[PDB]
């Protein structure tokens, strides 16, 4: 989908980049791809639905049982109000490797903003919420780019077995994202 230079990202932009990333990972590292879930932002919201059957359907679609890593773009859009379509994006990485100590790392470029939703999603994925560091946004429109570039940097670190997932040094590129979406 078309994305402008300062346009707020919609779920369609996040989903499209996650589709490209999933295909890129499948080709370059199929063993990591098989163990990783790039969750559609709409499905991530379904996971926190007040409707139990909606949340469970979404859980089945994610199939977290056979995954070591879940990447969830977290929108703050309303579940019950048609007019409140969201203000902010953040990123939840669920590390399921220790099948007894699941950790949900919450990366928010406005520290604290989405923590309540992150906690609800972490609980529904049987994981303990941990705030994780990410470079803080210096404008009010790039949170979605932090989510996407943060995901891509985390995937590189996981593929490389790097121990430190601190994203305080993250470099964002809206232009490169726009290039990917337009390809």
């Amino acid at each position: 989908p078309v994305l402008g230079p300062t346009q707020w990202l919609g779920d369609e932009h996040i989903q499209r980049d996650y589709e490209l990333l999933a295909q890129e990972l499948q080709q370059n590292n199929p063993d990591l791809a098989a163990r990783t879930r790039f969750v559609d932002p709409l499905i991530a919201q379904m996971l926190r639905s007040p409707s139990k059957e909606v949340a469970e359907r979404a859980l089945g679609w994610v199939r977290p049982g056979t995954a070591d890593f879940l990447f969830l773009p977290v929108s703050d859009a309303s579940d019950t109000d048609r007019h409140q379509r969201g203000s902010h994006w953040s990123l939840l990485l669920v590390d399921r490797r220790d099948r007894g100590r699941r950790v949900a790392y919450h990366y928010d470029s406005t520290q604290g903003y989405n923590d309540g939703l992150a906690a609800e999603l972490a609980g529904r994925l049987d994981a303990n919420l941990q705030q994780a560091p990410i470079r803080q946004q210096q404008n009010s429109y790039d949170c979605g780019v932090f989510v996407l570039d943060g995901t891509r940097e985390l995937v590189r670190r996981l593929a490389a077995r790097r121990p430190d997932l601190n994203l305080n040094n993250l470099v964002i590129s809206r232009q490169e994202l726009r290039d990917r979406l337009g390809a």
Binding site: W8, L9, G10, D11, E12, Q15, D40, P41, L42, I43, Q45, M46, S49, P50, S51, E53, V54, R57, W61, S75, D76, A77, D79, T80, R82, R85, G86, S87, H88, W89, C143, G144
Partner: protein, 77 residues
């Protein structure tokens, strides 16, 4: 020739439809948004973990009677 489908909203609301398997899902989507008084362009429909396109038909997606389509409002941030 006919198939019964449920559209399930994010708040749990349900609407039931009966349509021909050769017909584009556009007709069901248009009718759901019309009935819900929401803009078609503000809603996404998901099935088997994927976003549905209005031009796809149930036969194209192997939908069987009783299948559920999840309707979600688009997000921005």
């Amino acid at each position: 020739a006919h198939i019964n489908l449920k559209v399930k909203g994010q708040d749990g609301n349900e609407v039931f439809f009966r349509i021909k398997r050769s017909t584009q899902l556009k007709k069901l989507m248009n009718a759901y948004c019309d009935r819900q008084s929401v803009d078609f362009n503000s809603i996404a429909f998901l099935f088997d973990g994927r976003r549905l396109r209005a031009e796809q038909t149930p036969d194209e997606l192997e939908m069987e009677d009783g299948d559920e389509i999840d309707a979600m409002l688009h997000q921005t941030g």
